[PDB]
Amino acid sequence: NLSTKFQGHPYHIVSASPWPFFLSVVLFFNCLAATLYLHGYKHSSVFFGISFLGLLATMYLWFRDMSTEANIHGAHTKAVTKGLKIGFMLFLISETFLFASIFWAFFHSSLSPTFELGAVWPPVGIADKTIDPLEVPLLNTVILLTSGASLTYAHYSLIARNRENALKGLYMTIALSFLFLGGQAYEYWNAPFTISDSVYGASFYFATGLHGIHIIVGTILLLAATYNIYTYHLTNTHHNGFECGIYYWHFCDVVWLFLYLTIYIWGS
Template identity: 40%
Template sequence: MADAHAKNHDYHLVDPSPWPFVGSMAAFVMAVGTVFWMHGSNPAVMIIGLLGVIYTMFMWWRDVIKEGQRGDHTPVVSLHLRYGMLMFIASEVMFFVAWFWAFFDASLFTGEAIQASRAAATGGVWPPKDIVVFDPWHLPLINTLILLTSGTTVTWAHHALLNNDRQGLKYGLWATVALGVLFTIVQAYEYAHAAFAFSRDNGGNIYGSTFFMATGFHGFHVLIGTIFLIVCLVRAYKGHFTPKAHFGFEAAAWYWHFVDVVWLFLFAAIYIWGSHGAVIPGH
């Protein structure tokens, strides 16, 4: 009776899982290995920890998918999964706020006395003196169009799924994955031809630092989102997702739209506004 009563509710009590412990241990090994690597040691410990983290992610998410497939994700559980994904995206928004803050601080307040060394390095102007920036209407515009198009294709896939159009779901996901890969290739080409560097030791400067941190982390998020969508594509071929139960795909679509929106802000702020400079207070 107690067992029957325990399952007569809308919540899912997860089975005992080793992955929280294994994941925390792997993350600890990776962190310690990274510190040792930064101090000149062999990166083997860091790599072992990283492989442990990746393995944990794969196995843990595999278990979550199995739970969803056997019906454990009730409407209440699905709602809370959505809350969790929204909170995760909100934390990612604040992550990018830091890079935008760094960029605007460096570009708008170069002349402050507390940043005199920075003013000397930039010449009191933005972009800094002797910096050749990217033309925003060339590769950056192409990548903007690529991401905007990918937003429409993932929406196409979503609507196809809602209408139980399995082929449309697969075609939309294939197109979105292809566009994500194309974006990464274009950005890699752009980075390879940058006229400025990231590290000050390699001739870098505050412009290169803020540019590569903001756009580079966005590129990393595009890579993660592409992998997320590839997993959804594999699951689509396995017959997963129904018009009423498809949170895994929905979460991937939300994440991809978030990546799209962040890029629009990056394109407008760093590529367009940042490349044309601004009037620096005190100059």
């Protein structure tokens, strides 16, 4: 009786895992180091670096062990992967409602400006120093749109059981994302105003930072996924991460188009 040696539920069993407790400890370390570095206390340089390397090691090892368990033990049943997809969707909805905070912050700071602002949301003297709608950021937006198109092409070709086409599409997407990051860094260096300069600069910088870190997360996800593909650990139906990344990238692109609509059209 084969079922006798087996359990009766398709849900995974995990034990040990010292990763969560030490991850909490290292996060506390990072928080303390950041708080100390805010006030400029001495010997606050190597502390932050050591804490960040510890955090990197701990969640990298957590991810490696989780992927291994999802690979060898084969606990990726239909119910488990469905629940993982619903959890990822719930997380991205939470991210949308997090970004809504900064969206309403900009809306409130813009619709009713203070009486020292000259009765115009664009600051007097700085209004002519704003970002024109037609410049390098528009090129970056078109690059991102073409990157999404290429990524969708690669995903469909991968559905068609194709290695070369999907891999080339992924390579083009990675290169386009890297050049987008370089262009964003260039625009950051050539920023007309600092974050501390009025509320316009602060809101712009806050809005751009979250998108930047989310795009960094997307790039690390893409490079990891191409690592698994090269390592020959991805199959036709054992591909939850691919669809998760695709959905996340489309979500982030939609958020980016909304930002491009508001900040660089209404504010200029």
